């Protein structure tokens, strides 16, 4: 297959799984989104506007928390908008996304 291929035993190529639960018009959710979008990372947004079930699903994963947003990286619970910004401020976010 013609091209410049990288070898290092990746086998099956997968990248970090990045997830965010949101309300579309939540100013905190929007701030969190801006941040990831700024990084250029690939992520999945679970926009649960008016969805009671999904909030419950969320809470199950988010340590009982129903506040928004809720962020996850490689199935690790990161937390809310606050949390991710603190991580970025400390130089800790990029190693997770990761680089």
């Amino acid at each position: 297959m013609r091209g410049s291929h990288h070898h290092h035993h990746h086998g099956s190529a997968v990248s970090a799984k990045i997830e965010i639960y949101t309300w579309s018009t939540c100013p905190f959710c929007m701030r969190a989104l801006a941040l990831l979008k700024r990084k250029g990372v690939e992520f999945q947004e679970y926009c649960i506007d008016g969805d009671n079930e999904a909030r419950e699903a969320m809470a199950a994963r988010a340590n009982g928390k129903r506040s928004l947003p809720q962020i996850f990286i490689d199935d690790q619970h990161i937390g809310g908008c606050d949390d991710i910004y603190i991580l970025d401020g400390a130089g800790k976010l990029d190693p997770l996304l990761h680089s």
Side-chain angles (χ1 to χ4, degrees):
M1 178 181 153
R2 173 220 206 259
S4 189
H5 322 297
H6 188 215
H7 301 285
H8 192 51
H9 287 222
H10 323 308
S12 274
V14 261
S15 229
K17 179 180 147 203
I18 309 168
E19 298 166 275
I20 191 184
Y21 300 77
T22 61
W23 274 21
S24 60
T25 37
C26 172
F28 298 100
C29 300
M30 311 150 46
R31 208 175 291 157
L33 291 169
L35 179 64
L36 295 157
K37 281 176 178 172
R38 284 185 333 248
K39 309 302 210 172
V41 291
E42 183 178 2
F43 69 95
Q44 196 73 8
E45 182 194 3
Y46 312 137
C47 185
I48 70 172
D49 291 18
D51 200 308
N52 318 69
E53 265 189 87
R55 190 82 74 104
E56 285 322 307
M58 191 188 61
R61 293 190 73 196
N63 213 63
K65 303 195 174 142
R66 310 194 175 45
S67 57
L68 301 170
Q70 297 301 331
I71 304 157
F72 292 83
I73 305 174
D74 286 327
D75 290 307
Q76 295 295 112
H77 187 194
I78 302 293
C81 174
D82 21 59
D83 293 321
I84 186 167
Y85 280 91
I86 298 154
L87 242 41
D88 202 34
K92 275 160 158 64
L93 187 57
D94 279 350
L96 308 165
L97 275 48
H98 65 5
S99 245

Coordinates of all heavy atoms in Angstrom, one line a residue:
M1 N 0.8 -1.2 0.0 CA 0.0 0.0 0.0 C 0.9 1.2 0.0 O 1.5 1.5 1.0 CB -0.9 0.0 1.2 CG -1.8 1.1 1.5 SD -2.7 0.8 3.1 CE -3.0 2.5 3.5
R2 N 0.9 1.9 -1.1 CA 1.8 3.1 -1.3 C 1.6 4.2 -0.2 O 0.6 4.6 0.1 CB 1.5 3.6 -2.6 CG 2.1 4.9 -2.9 CD 1.1 5.8 -3.7 NE 1.8 6.7 -4.5 CZ 2.0 8.0 -4.3 NH1 1.5 8.6 -3.2 NH2 2.6 8.7 -5.1
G3 N 2.7 4.7 0.4 CA 2.6 5.7 1.4 C 3.7 5.6 2.4 O 4.5 4.7 2.3
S4 N 3.7 6.5 3.3 CA 4.6 6.6 4.4 C 3.9 6.2 5.6 O 3.1 6.9 6.2 CB 5.1 8.1 4.5 OG 6.1 8.3 5.3
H5 N 4.1 4.9 6.0 CA 3.5 4.2 7.1 C 4.3 4.2 8.3 O 5.5 3.9 8.3 CB 3.0 2.7 6.7 CG 2.4 2.5 5.4 ND1 1.3 3.2 4.9 CD2 2.8 1.7 4.3 CE1 1.1 2.8 3.6 NE2 2.0 2.0 3.3
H6 N 3.7 4.3 9.5 CA 4.3 4.3 10.7 C 4.1 2.9 11.3 O 3.1 2.4 11.5 CB 3.6 5.3 11.7 CG 4.3 5.4 13.0 ND1 3.7 5.6 14.2 CD2 5.6 5.3 13.3 CE1 4.5 5.7 15.2 NE2 5.7 5.5 14.6
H7 N 5.2 2.3 11.7 CA 5.2 1.0 12.4 C 5.6 1.2 13.8 O 6.6 1.7 14.1 CB 6.2 0.0 11.7 CG 5.9 -0.2 10.3 ND1 4.8 -1.0 9.9 CD2 6.4 0.3 9.2 CE1 4.7 -1.0 8.6 NE2 5.6 -0.2 8.1
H8 N 4.7 0.7 14.7 CA 5.1 0.4 16.0 C 4.0 -0.4 16.8 O 3.6 -0.1 17.9 CB 5.3 1.7 16.8 CG 5.9 1.4 18.2 ND1 7.0 0.6 18.4 CD2 5.5 1.8 19.4 CE1 7.3 0.6 19.7 NE2 6.4 1.3 20.3
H9 N 3.6 -1.5 16.1 CA 2.9 -2.6 16.8 C 1.5 -2.1 17.2 O 1.0 -2.6 18.2 CB 3.7 -3.0 18.0 CG 4.9 -3.9 17.7 ND1 5.3 -5.0 18.4 CD2 5.9 -3.7 16.7 CE1 6.3 -5.5 17.9 NE2 6.7 -4.8 16.9
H10 N 0.9 -1.1 16.5 CA -0.4 -0.6 16.9 C -1.5 -1.7 16.7 O -2.5 -1.6 17.3 CB -0.8 0.7 16.2 CG 0.4 1.6 16.0 ND1 1.3 1.9 17.0 CD2 0.9 2.2 14.9 CE1 2.2 2.7 16.5 NE2 2.0 2.9 15.2
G11 N -1.1 -2.6 15.9 CA -2.1 -3.6 15.4 C -3.2 -2.9 14.9 O -3.1 -2.0 14.0
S12 N -4.4 -3.1 15.5 CA -5.7 -2.4 15.4 C -5.6 -0.9 15.9 O -5.7 -0.7 17.1 CB -6.7 -3.1 16.3 OG -7.3 -4.2 15.6
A13 N -5.7 0.0 15.0 CA -5.5 1.4 15.3 C -6.8 1.9 15.9 O -7.8 2.0 15.3 CB -5.2 2.2 14.1
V14 N -6.7 2.4 17.1 CA -7.7 3.1 17.8 C -7.0 4.3 18.5 O -5.9 4.2 18.9 CB -8.4 2.3 18.8 CG1 -9.7 1.8 18.2 CG2 -7.6 1.1 19.2
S15 N -7.8 5.4 18.7 CA -7.3 6.6 19.2 C -8.1 6.8 20.5 O -9.0 6.0 20.8 CB -7.7 7.7 18.3 OG -6.7 8.6 18.0
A16 N -7.8 7.8 21.3 CA -8.5 8.0 22.6 C -10.0 8.2 22.4 O -10.4 8.7 21.5 CB -7.8 9.2 23.3
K17 N -10.7 7.6 23.3 CA -12.1 7.7 23.2 C -12.5 8.9 24.1 O -12.2 8.9 25.2 CB -12.8 6.4 23.7 CG -14.3 6.3 23.7 CD -14.8 4.9 24.1 CE -16.1 4.9 24.9 NZ -16.3 3.8 25.7
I18 N -13.1 9.9 23.4 CA -13.4 11.1 24.1 C -14.9 11.3 24.0 O -15.4 11.3 22.9 CB -12.6 12.3 23.6 CG1 -11.1 12.0 23.5 CG2 -12.8 13.6 24.4 CD1 -10.3 13.0 22.7
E19 N -15.5 11.5 25.1 CA -16.9 11.7 25.2 C -17.3 12.9 26.1 O -16.7 13.1 27.1 CB -17.5 10.4 25.9 CG -17.4 9.1 25.2 CD -17.7 7.9 26.1 OE1 -16.8 7.5 26.8 OE2 -18.8 7.4 26.1
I20 N -18.4 13.6 25.7 CA -19.0 14.6 26.5 C -20.5 14.6 26.4 O -21.1 14.6 25.4 CB -18.4 16.0 26.0 CG1 -18.9 17.1 27.1 CG2 -18.8 16.4 24.6 CD1 -18.5 18.5 26.8
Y21 N -21.1 14.6 27.6 CA -22.5 14.7 27.7 C -22.9 16.3 27.9 O -22.3 16.9 28.7 CB -23.1 14.0 28.9 CG -22.9 12.5 29.0 CD1 -21.7 11.9 29.3 CD2 -24.0 11.6 28.6 CE1 -21.5 10.6 29.3 CE2 -23.8 10.2 28.6 CZ -22.6 9.7 29.0 OH -22.4 8.4 29.0
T22 N -23.8 16.7 27.1 CA -24.2 18.1 27.0 C -25.7 18.4 26.9 O -26.5 17.6 26.6 CB -23.6 18.8 25.8 OG1 -24.1 18.1 24.6 CG2 -22.2 18.7 25.7
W23 N -26.1 19.6 27.3 CA -27.2 20.4 26.8 C -26.6 21.4 25.7 O -25.7 22.1 26.0 CB -28.1 21.0 27.8 CG -29.3 20.1 28.4 CD1 -29.3 18.8 28.3 CD2 -30.5 20.5 29.0 NE1 -30.4 18.3 28.9 CE2 -31.2 19.3 29.3 CE3 -31.0 21.7 29.4 CZ2 -32.3 19.4 30.0 CZ3 -32.2 21.7 30.0 CH2 -32.8 20.6 30.3
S24 N -27.2 21.4 24.5 CA -26.7 22.2 23.5 C -26.5 23.7 23.9 O -25.6 24.3 23.5 CB -27.6 22.2 22.3 OG -28.9 22.7 22.6
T25 N -27.5 24.2 24.6 CA -27.4 25.6 25.0 C -26.9 25.9 26.4 O -27.1 27.0 26.9 CB -28.8 26.2 25.1 OG1 -29.7 25.3 25.5 CG2 -29.2 26.7 23.7
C26 N -26.3 24.9 27.0 CA -25.6 25.1 28.3 C -24.3 25.9 28.1 O -23.4 25.5 27.4 CB -25.4 23.9 29.1 SG -24.4 24.0 30.5
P27 N -24.1 27.0 28.8 CA -23.0 27.9 28.6 C -21.7 27.2 29.1 O -20.7 27.4 28.6 CB -23.3 29.1 29.5 CG -24.1 28.6 30.6 CD -25.0 27.5 29.9
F28 N -21.8 26.3 30.1 CA -20.7 25.5 30.5 C -20.4 24.4 29.5 O -19.3 24.1 29.3 CB -21.0 25.0 31.9 CG -21.1 26.0 33.0 CD1 -22.3 26.4 33.4 CD2 -20.1 26.6 33.5 CE1 -22.5 27.4 34.3 CE2 -20.2 27.6 34.5 CZ -21.5 28.0 34.9
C29 N -21.4 23.7 29.0 CA -21.3 22.7 28.0 C -20.6 23.4 26.8 O -19.7 22.8 26.3 CB -22.5 22.0 27.7 SG -23.2 21.1 29.1
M30 N -21.1 24.6 26.4 CA -20.5 25.2 25.2 C -19.0 25.6 25.4 O -18.3 25.3 24.6 CB -21.3 26.4 24.7 CG -22.8 26.2 24.5 SD -23.9 27.6 24.8 CE -23.0 28.8 23.9
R31 N -18.7 26.1 26.6 CA -17.3 26.3 26.9 C -16.4 25.1 26.8 O -15.3 25.1 26.3 CB -17.1 26.9 28.3 CG -15.9 27.8 28.5 CD -15.9 28.5 29.9 NE -16.9 29.5 30.0 CZ -17.4 29.9 31.2 NH1 -17.1 29.5 32.3 NH2 -18.3 30.9 31.1
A32 N -16.9 23.9 27.3 CA -16.1 22.7 27.3 C -15.9 22.3 25.8 O -14.9 21.9 25.4 CB -16.8 21.6 28.1
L33 N -17.0 22.4 25.0 CA -16.9 22.0 23.6 C -15.9 22.9 22.8 O -15.2 22.3 22.0 CB -18.3 22.2 23.0 CG -19.3 21.1 23.4 CD1 -20.7 21.5 23.0 CD2 -18.9 19.8 22.9
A34 N -15.9 24.2 23.0 CA -15.0 25.1 22.5 C -13.6 24.6 22.7 O -12.8 24.6 21.9 CB -15.1 26.5 23.0
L35 N -13.3 24.2 23.9 CA -12.0 23.8 24.3 C -11.5 22.6 23.5 O -10.5 22.6 23.0 CB -11.9 23.5 25.8 CG -10.5 23.0 26.1 CD1 -9.4 24.1 25.9 CD2 -10.3 22.5 27.5
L36 N -12.3 21.5 23.5 CA -11.9 20.3 22.7 C -11.9 20.6 21.2 O -11.0 20.2 20.6 CB -12.9 19.2 22.9 CG -13.0 18.7 24.3 CD1 -14.3 18.0 24.6 CD2 -11.8 17.8 24.6
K37 N -12.8 21.4 20.7 CA -12.8 21.7 19.3 C -11.5 22.5 18.9 O -11.0 22.2 18.0 CB -14.0 22.6 19.0 CG -15.3 21.9 18.9 CD -16.4 22.9 18.6 CE -17.7 22.3 18.4 NZ -18.8 23.3 18.4
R38 N -11.1 23.4 19.8 CA -9.8 24.1 19.7 C -8.6 23.2 19.6 O -7.7 23.5 18.9 CB -9.6 25.1 20.8 CG -10.4 26.4 20.5 CD -10.3 27.6 21.4 NE -9.9 27.3 22.7 CZ -10.7 27.5 23.8 NH1 -11.9 28.0 23.6 NH2 -10.3 27.3 25.0
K39 N -8.5 22.1 20.4 CA -7.6 21.1 20.3 C -7.5 20.3 19.0 O -6.6 19.7 18.7 CB -7.6 20.1 21.5 CG -7.7 20.7 22.9 CD -6.5 21.5 23.2 CE -6.2 21.4 24.7 NZ -5.0 22.1 25.1
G40 N -8.6 20.4 18.2 CA -8.6 19.6 17.0 C -8.9 18.1 17.2 O -8.8 17.4 16.3
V41 N -9.1 17.7 18.4 CA -9.4 16.3 18.7 C -10.7 15.8 18.1 O -11.6 16.6 17.9 CB -9.4 15.9 20.1 CG1 -8.0 16.0 20.6 CG2 -10.4 16.8 20.9
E42 N -10.8 14.5 17.9 CA -12.0 13.8 17.5 C -12.8 13.4 18.7 O -12.3 12.7 19.6 CB -11.6 12.7 16.6 CG -12.8 11.9 16.0 CD -12.4 10.8 15.1 OE1 -11.2 10.6 14.9 OE2 -13.4 10.2 14.5
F43 N -14.0 13.8 18.8 CA -14.9 13.4 19.9 C -16.3 13.2 19.7 O -16.9 13.6 18.7 CB -14.6 14.3 21.2 CG -15.1 15.7 21.0 CD1 -16.3 16.0 21.4 CD2 -14.3 16.6 20.3 CE1 -16.8 17.3 21.2 CE2 -14.8 17.9 20.1 CZ -16.0 18.2 20.6
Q44 N -17.0 12.5 20.6 CA -18.3 12.2 20.5 C -19.2 13.0 21.6 O -18.9 13.0 22.7 CB -18.6 10.7 20.7 CG -20.0 10.2 20.3 CD -20.2 10.2 18.8 OE1 -19.2 10.4 18.1 NE2 -21.4 10.0 18.4
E45 N -20.1 13.8 21.1 CA -21.0 14.6 22.0 C -22.4 13.9 22.1 O -23.0 13.7 21.2 CB -21.2 16.0 21.4 CG -22.1 16.9 22.3 CD -22.6 18.2 21.6 OE1 -22.3 18.3 20.4 OE2 -23.3 19.0 22.2
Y46 N -22.7 13.6 23.3 CA -24.0 13.1 23.6 C -24.9 14.2 24.1 O -24.9 14.5 25.2 CB -24.0 12.0 24.7 CG -22.9 10.9 24.5 CD1 -22.2 10.5 25.5 CD2 -22.7 10.3 23.3 CE1 -21.2 9.5 25.4 CE2 -21.8 9.3 23.1 CZ -21.1 8.9 24.1 OH -20.2 8.0 23.9
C47 N -25.4 14.9 23.1 CA -26.5 16.0 23.4 C -28.0 15.5 23.8 O -28.6 14.8 23.1 CB -26.7 16.8 22.1 SG -27.8 18.2 22.5
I48 N -28.0 15.5 25.1 CA -29.1 14.9 25.8 C -30.2 16.0 26.2 O -31.0 15.7 27.1 CB -28.7 14.1 27.0 CG1 -28.1 14.9 28.0 CG2 -27.8 13.0 26.5 CD1 -27.8 14.2 29.3
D49 N -30.3 17.1 25.5 CA -31.4 18.0 25.6 C -32.8 17.3 25.9 O -33.2 16.5 25.1 CB -31.6 18.9 24.4 CG -30.4 19.9 24.1 OD1 -29.4 19.7 24.7 OD2 -30.6 20.9 23.4
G50 N -33.4 17.6 27.0 CA -34.7 17.2 27.4 C -34.9 15.6 27.6 O -36.0 15.1 27.8
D51 N -33.7 15.0 27.6 CA -33.7 13.5 27.7 C -33.4 13.0 29.1 O -32.3 12.9 29.5 CB -32.7 12.9 26.7 CG -33.0 11.5 26.4 OD1 -33.0 10.7 27.3 OD2 -33.1 11.1 25.2
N52 N -34.4 12.7 29.8 CA -34.4 12.2 31.2 C -33.6 10.9 31.4 O -32.8 10.8 32.3 CB -35.8 12.1 31.8 CG -36.7 13.2 31.3 OD1 -37.0 13.4 30.2 ND2 -37.1 14.1 32.3
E53 N -33.8 10.0 30.5 CA -33.2 8.6 30.5 C -31.7 8.7 30.3 O -31.0 8.1 31.1 CB -33.7 7.7 29.4 CG -34.8 6.8 29.8 CD -35.2 5.8 28.8 OE1 -34.6 4.7 28.8 OE2 -36.1 6.1 28.0
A54 N -31.3 9.5 29.4 CA -29.9 9.7 29.1 C -29.2 10.4 30.3 O -28.1 10.0 30.6 CB -29.7 10.4 27.8
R55 N -29.9 11.3 30.9 CA -29.3 11.9 32.1 C -29.0 10.8 33.2 O -28.1 10.8 33.8 CB -30.2 13.1 32.6 CG -29.5 13.9 33.6 CD -28.6 14.9 33.0 NE -29.4 15.9 32.4 CZ -29.6 17.1 32.8 NH1 -29.0 17.5 33.9 NH2 -30.5 17.9 32.2
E56 N -30.0 9.9 33.3 CA -29.8 8.9 34.3 C -28.7 8.0 33.9 O -27.9 7.6 34.7 CB -31.2 8.1 34.4 CG -32.3 8.8 35.2 CD -31.8 9.6 36.3 OE1 -31.1 9.1 37.2 OE2 -32.1 10.8 36.4
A57 N -28.6 7.6 32.6 CA -27.5 6.8 32.1 C -26.2 7.6 32.4 O -25.3 7.0 32.9 CB -27.7 6.7 30.6
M58 N -26.2 8.8 32.1 CA -25.0 9.6 32.4 C -24.6 9.5 33.8 O -23.5 9.3 34.0 CB -25.3 11.1 32.1 CG -24.0 12.0 32.2 SD -24.3 13.7 32.1 CE -25.3 14.1 33.5
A59 N -25.5 9.7 34.7 CA -25.3 9.8 36.1 C -24.7 8.5 36.6 O -23.8 8.5 37.4 CB -26.5 10.0 36.8
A60 N -25.1 7.4 36.0 CA -24.6 6.1 36.3 C -23.1 6.0 36.2 O -22.4 5.4 36.9 CB -25.3 5.1 35.5
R61 N -22.6 6.6 35.1 CA -21.2 6.7 34.8 C -20.4 7.8 35.5 O -19.3 7.7 35.7 CB -21.0 6.9 33.3 CG -21.5 5.7 32.4 CD -21.0 6.0 31.0 NE -19.6 5.9 30.7 CZ -19.0 6.4 29.6 NH1 -19.7 7.2 28.8 NH2 -17.8 6.2 29.4
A62 N -21.1 8.9 35.9 CA -20.5 10.1 36.3 C -20.5 10.3 37.8 O -20.6 11.4 38.3 CB -21.3 11.3 35.7
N63 N -20.5 9.1 38.5 CA -20.4 9.1 39.9 C -21.6 9.7 40.6 O -21.5 10.3 41.6 CB -19.1 9.9 40.1 CG -18.3 9.4 41.3 OD1 -17.9 8.3 41.3 ND2 -18.2 10.3 42.3
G64 N -22.7 9.5 40.0 CA -24.0 9.9 40.5 C -24.3 11.4 40.0 O -25.4 11.8 40.2
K65 N -23.4 12.1 39.5 CA -23.6 13.5 39.1 C -24.4 13.7 37.9 O -24.3 13.0 36.9 CB -22.2 14.2 39.0 CG -21.3 14.1 40.2 CD -20.2 15.0 40.2 CE -19.4 15.0 41.5 NZ -17.9 15.1 41.5
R66 N -25.4 14.6 38.0 CA -26.2 15.0 36.9 C -26.0 16.4 36.3 O -26.7 16.8 35.5 CB -27.8 14.8 37.2 CG -28.2 13.5 37.8 CD -29.7 13.3 37.8 NE -30.1 12.0 38.2 CZ -29.7 11.4 39.3 NH1 -28.8 12.0 40.0 NH2 -30.0 10.2 39.7
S67 N -25.0 17.0 36.9 CA -24.6 18.3 36.4 C -24.0 18.2 35.0 O -23.6 17.2 34.6 CB -23.6 19.0 37.4 OG -22.5 18.2 37.6
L68 N -24.0 19.3 34.2 CA -23.4 19.2 32.9 C -22.4 20.3 32.7 O -22.4 21.3 33.3 CB -24.5 19.5 31.9 CG -25.7 18.6 31.9 CD1 -26.7 19.2 31.0 CD2 -25.4 17.2 31.4
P69 N -21.5 20.1 31.7 CA -21.3 18.8 31.1 C -20.7 17.7 32.0 O -20.3 17.9 33.1 CB -20.3 19.1 30.0 CG -19.4 20.0 30.7 CD -20.3 20.9 31.4
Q70 N -20.5 16.5 31.4 CA -19.7 15.4 32.0 C -18.7 14.9 30.8 O -19.2 14.5 29.8 CB -20.5 14.3 32.6 CG -21.4 14.6 33.8 CD -20.6 15.2 34.9 OE1 -19.4 14.9 35.1 NE2 -21.2 16.0 35.8
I71 N -17.5 14.9 31.1 CA -16.5 14.5 30.2 C -15.8 13.2 30.6 O -15.4 13.0 31.7 CB -15.5 15.6 30.1 CG1 -16.1 16.9 29.7 CG2 -14.3 15.2 29.2 CD1 -15.4 18.1 30.1
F72 N -15.4 12.4 29.6 CA -14.7 11.1 29.8 C -13.7 10.9 28.7 O -13.9 11.1 27.5 CB -15.7 9.9 29.7 CG -16.7 9.8 30.8 CD1 -17.8 10.5 30.8 CD2 -16.5 8.9 31.8 CE1 -18.7 10.4 31.8 CE2 -17.3 8.8 32.8 CZ -18.5 9.5 32.9
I73 N -12.5 10.5 29.1 CA -11.4 10.2 28.2 C -10.8 8.8 28.6 O -10.4 8.5 29.6 CB -10.2 11.3 28.3 CG1 -10.8 12.7 28.0 CG2 -9.0 10.8 27.5 CD1 -9.8 13.8 28.2
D74 N -10.9 7.9 27.6 CA -10.6 6.5 27.7 C -11.3 5.9 28.8 O -10.8 5.3 29.6 CB -9.1 6.2 27.8 CG -8.4 6.4 26.5 OD1 -8.9 6.2 25.4 OD2 -7.3 6.9 26.6
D75 N -12.6 6.1 28.9 CA -13.5 5.7 29.9 C -13.2 6.2 31.3 O -13.9 5.8 32.2 CB -13.6 4.2 29.9 CG -14.3 3.7 28.7 OD1 -15.4 4.1 28.4 OD2 -13.7 2.9 28.0
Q76 N -12.2 7.0 31.5 CA -12.0 7.7 32.7 C -12.9 9.0 32.9 O -13.0 9.8 32.0 CB -10.6 8.2 32.7 CG -9.6 7.2 32.8 CD -9.7 6.4 34.0 OE1 -10.1 5.2 34.0 NE2 -9.3 7.0 35.1
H77 N -13.5 9.1 34.1 CA -14.4 10.2 34.4 C -13.5 11.5 34.6 O -12.9 11.6 35.6 CB -15.2 10.0 35.6 CG -16.2 11.0 35.9 ND1 -16.8 11.2 37.1 CD2 -16.6 12.0 35.1 CE1 -17.6 12.2 37.0 NE2 -17.5 12.7 35.8
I78 N -13.5 12.4 33.7 CA -12.8 13.7 33.9 C -13.6 14.7 34.7 O -12.9 15.5 35.5 CB -12.5 14.3 32.5 CG1 -11.7 13.4 31.7 CG2 -11.6 15.6 32.7 CD1 -10.3 13.1 32.2
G79 N -14.9 14.8 34.6 CA -15.7 15.7 35.2 C -16.3 16.8 34.3 O -16.6 16.6 33.1
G80 N -16.5 18.0 34.8 CA -17.2 19.1 34.2 C -16.3 20.1 33.4 O -15.2 19.8 33.2
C81 N -16.9 21.2 33.1 CA -16.2 22.2 32.3 C -15.0 22.8 33.1 O -14.0 22.9 32.7 CB -17.1 23.3 31.9 SG -16.3 24.7 31.2
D82 N -15.3 23.1 34.4 CA -14.3 23.4 35.4 C -13.1 22.5 35.4 O -12.0 23.0 35.3 CB -15.0 23.3 36.8 CG -16.3 22.3 36.8 OD1 -16.2 21.1 36.4 OD2 -17.3 22.9 37.2
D83 N -13.4 21.3 35.5 CA -12.4 20.3 35.7 C -11.5 20.2 34.5 O -10.3 20.0 34.7 CB -13.1 18.9 35.9 CG -13.8 18.8 37.2 OD1 -13.4 19.4 38.3 OD2 -14.9 18.2 37.3
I84 N -12.0 20.3 33.3 CA -11.2 20.1 32.2 C -10.3 21.3 31.9 O -9.2 21.2 31.6 CB -12.0 19.8 30.9 CG1 -11.2 19.4 29.8 CG2 -13.1 20.8 30.6 CD1 -11.9 18.8 28.6
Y85 N -10.8 22.5 32.2 CA -10.0 23.7 32.2 C -8.9 23.7 33.2 O -7.9 24.0 32.8 CB -10.9 25.0 32.2 CG -11.5 25.3 30.9 CD1 -12.7 24.8 30.5 CD2 -10.8 26.1 30.1 CE1 -13.2 25.1 29.2 CE2 -11.3 26.5 28.9 CZ -12.5 26.0 28.4 OH -13.0 26.4 27.2
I86 N -9.2 23.3 34.4 CA -8.1 23.1 35.4 C -6.9 22.2 34.9 O -5.8 22.5 35.0 CB -8.6 22.7 36.7 CG1 -9.5 23.7 37.3 CG2 -7.4 22.5 37.6 CD1 -10.4 23.2 38.3
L87 N -7.3 21.0 34.4 CA -6.5 20.1 33.8 C -5.6 20.8 32.7 O -4.5 20.6 32.6 CB -7.3 19.0 33.3 CG -7.1 17.6 33.7 CD1 -6.9 17.4 35.2 CD2 -8.2 16.7 33.2
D88 N -6.3 21.6 31.8 CA -5.5 22.3 30.7 C -4.6 23.3 31.2 O -3.5 23.5 30.7 CB -6.5 22.9 29.7 CG -5.8 23.1 28.3 OD1 -4.9 22.3 28.0 OD2 -6.1 24.0 27.7
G89 N -5.0 24.1 32.2 CA -4.2 25.0 32.9 C -3.0 24.5 33.6 O -1.9 25.1 33.6
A90 N -3.1 23.2 34.0 CA -1.9 22.6 34.7 C -1.0 21.9 33.7 O -0.1 21.3 34.1 CB -2.4 21.8 35.8
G91 N -1.3 21.9 32.5 CA -0.5 21.1 31.5 C -0.8 19.6 31.5 O 0.0 18.9 31.2
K92 N -2.0 19.3 31.9 CA -2.4 17.9 32.1 C -3.4 17.3 31.1 O -3.7 16.2 31.1 CB -3.0 17.6 33.4 CG -2.1 17.4 34.5 CD -2.8 17.6 35.8 CE -2.2 17.0 37.0 NZ -0.8 17.4 37.3
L93 N -4.0 18.2 30.3 CA -5.0 17.8 29.4 C -4.4 17.1 28.2 O -4.9 16.1 27.8 CB -6.0 18.9 29.0 CG -7.2 18.5 28.2 CD1 -7.9 17.4 29.0 CD2 -8.0 19.5 27.7
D94 N -3.4 17.7 27.6 CA -2.9 17.2 26.3 C -2.4 15.8 26.5 O -2.7 15.0 25.6 CB -1.8 18.2 25.8 CG -2.4 19.4 25.1 OD1 -3.6 19.5 24.8 OD2 -1.7 20.3 24.9
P95 N -1.6 15.4 27.5 CA -1.2 14.1 27.6 C -2.4 13.1 27.6 O -2.1 11.9 27.4 CB -0.5 14.0 29.0 CG -0.2 15.4 29.3 CD -1.2 16.2 28.6
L96 N -3.6 13.5 27.9 CA -4.7 12.6 27.9 C -5.4 12.4 26.5 O -5.9 11.4 26.3 CB -5.8 13.0 28.8 CG -5.5 13.3 30.3 CD1 -6.6 14.0 31.0 CD2 -5.0 12.1 31.0
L97 N -5.4 13.5 25.7 CA -6.1 13.5 24.4 C -5.5 12.7 23.2 O -6.2 12.4 22.3 CB -6.3 14.9 24.0 CG -7.6 15.6 24.5 CD1 -7.7 15.4 26.0 CD2 -7.4 17.0 24.2
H98 N -4.3 12.2 23.2 CA -3.3 12.6 24.0 C -2.1 13.0 23.2 O -1.4 12.2 22.7 CB -2.9 11.5 25.0 CG -2.4 10.3 24.3 ND1 -2.2 10.3 22.9 CD2 -2.1 9.0 24.7 CE1 -1.7 9.1 22.6 NE2 -1.6 8.3 23.6
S99 N -1.9 14.3 23.0 CA -0.6 15.0 22.9 C -1.4 16.0 22.1 O -2.5 15.8 22.0 CB 0.4 14.3 22.1 OG 1.6 13.9 22.9

